[PDB]
Symmetry: C3
Subunit: 138 residues, 3 copies
C-alpha cells in the first residue's frame, strides 16, 4: 500500500489527522488551521492554511478538491480546483477558498473546508511531430 | 474490462442511458432529469438531479466535470468541480451548476449539463512524521 | 513507456515546448500563443489558443488545471477546470480563463495560463441494473 507521510505544523497539532470518512472514501478531509473564525465576503478569495506538510510518494499526486456540502449550502468552493499538490512539495499546504454566493460566509477553526485526493500521475515524454486521423476530428 | 452499474430513477427512465460520445471519450454524458426548464440568474447556483444511482467499482471514483461547450457559450460550470463521487455512494448523483456569465441561462429537459469520468483513485495509509525529506522545489 | 505527441502551429512555434518545471512536476506548462495582451475584464471569460495539437495515448487523457499563483495573486482560474482533453482530440487545445477578482488582468503573450496533466482514464461498460450493492455509506 502507498504511504502518505504528514507532518503537523504548530497550528495543526490540536486538530485530528486527515482520515477517510468511509472505508471507500476517495480523499482525506482538510481543515482550516486558523486561530479565530474567518469572514469571507461574497466574490473574493481567501488563502486558508492547513498546517500540513506532506511527502507524496513518486508516481502519485495530491488534488485539493471542493467539499460538496460547503458548495451547495453556502456557495463556497476551492478557487483553483483541482489544486495540484506536486509529489515533491515540502511547504505548507494551503487552500484557496472563494465565495461565489451572494451572502456572507464564516469558516470556523478546524472546519473541514476541502478534501485532498491522492491519485496516480502519468509523466509523459514530450516529442514534437508534424497527428493520427480520428473520428472525433477537431 | 470494467463495468458500471446504473439504476435509472423514474425521472430518468425516459432519458437515454449515459454513453460515451466518441469511441475514445473520457466521460459519460450527465443529463438534467428535470421536468420544466430551469432558469439560473447570474451568480446563481442550482442542484440538478440526474436520476442516476451508480455502482462505481472498487478502486475507482467518479468525477463530475464541467462541459466545455456550456462553459464557453454561456459561462455555466460545475461549482464543486471536480465533484467527487465515492465508490460506496448509493445515493442519486446530483450536479451543482453555477452561472458565472452575465446573462440568464435556461437548462432544458434532459440537457447535457456535465460529464462523469471514471478514474482510478489510490487509497493511502496515513502516517505522521516529525520531519520530511528535503527536496528540489522546496516550499 | 508512455509517449505524448504534439504538433505545433505557426503562432506557437517560438514558445518553448510544454515541459515539466521539476523532475517531479505533475503538469506541463500551458502558454498563451497570442499576439497582443489580453484585456481581462472582471467577471469575463475568454478563449485563449495554445497552438498545440496533441495525440494522447489510448487509456490516457489530458487535464487543464489552474495555476495556483494566478488564482491567488490575480484571481484568475480555468472556468471548466479540470478541462477534459479527450484522447481522440486532433484539434487545437484552448484554455478558458475567467476573472474572479476585482481588478482587470493583463495576459502577456506566451504567459503560463494553466497546466496540462496526463492521467490514466478507465473506460467502463454501462450495464443498467435494478439494484445496487449495499454499502456502509448508504444512500447519501
Ligand atoms: O490549492 C493549492 C494548490 C497548490 N498548492 C501548492 C502545490 C505546489 O507545490 C504549489 C504550486 O506552485 P507553482 O508555482 O504554481 O507550481 O502550490 C497548494 O498549496 N494549494
Ligand atoms: O457534485 C457532487 C459531489 C458529490 N456527490 C455525492 C458523492 C459523494 O459520495 C456524496 C457525499 O459527498 P461528501 O463529499 O461526503 O459531502 O455526494 C454528488 O452527488 N454530486
Ligand atoms: O479546457 C478545455 C476542454 C476541452 N478542450 C477540447 C478538447 C476536448 O477533446 C474537446 C471536448 O469538446 P466537446 O465538444 O465538449 O466534446 O474540447 C479544450 O481545448 N480545452
Ligand atoms: Mg467546443
Ligand atoms: Mg506558490
Amino acid at each position: 500500500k502507498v504511504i502518505l507521510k504528514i507532518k503537523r505544523l504548530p497550528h495543526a497539532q490540536d486538530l485530528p489527522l486527515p482520515s477517510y470518512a468511509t472505508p471507500h472514501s476517495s480523499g482525506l478531509d482538510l481543515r482550516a488551521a486558523i486561530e479565530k473564525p474567518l469572514k469571507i465576503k461574497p466574490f473574493e478569495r481567501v488563502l486558508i492554511p492547513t498546517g500540513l506538510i506532506l511527502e507524496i510518494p513518486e508516481g502519485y499526486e495530491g488534488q485539493v478538491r471542493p467539499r460538496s456540502g460547503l458548495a451547495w449550502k453556502k456557495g463556497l468552493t476551492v478557487l483553483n480546483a483541482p489544486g495540484t499538490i506536486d509529489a515533491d512539495y515540502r511547504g505548507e499546504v494551503k487552500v484557496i477558498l472563494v465565495n461565489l454566493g451572494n451572502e456572507e460566509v464564516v469558516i470556523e477553526r478546524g472546519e473541514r473546508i476541502a478534501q485532498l485526493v491522492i491519485a496516480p500521475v502519468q509523466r509523459v515524454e514530450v516529442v514534437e511531430v508534424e497527428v493520427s486521423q480520428t473520428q472525433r476530428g477537431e
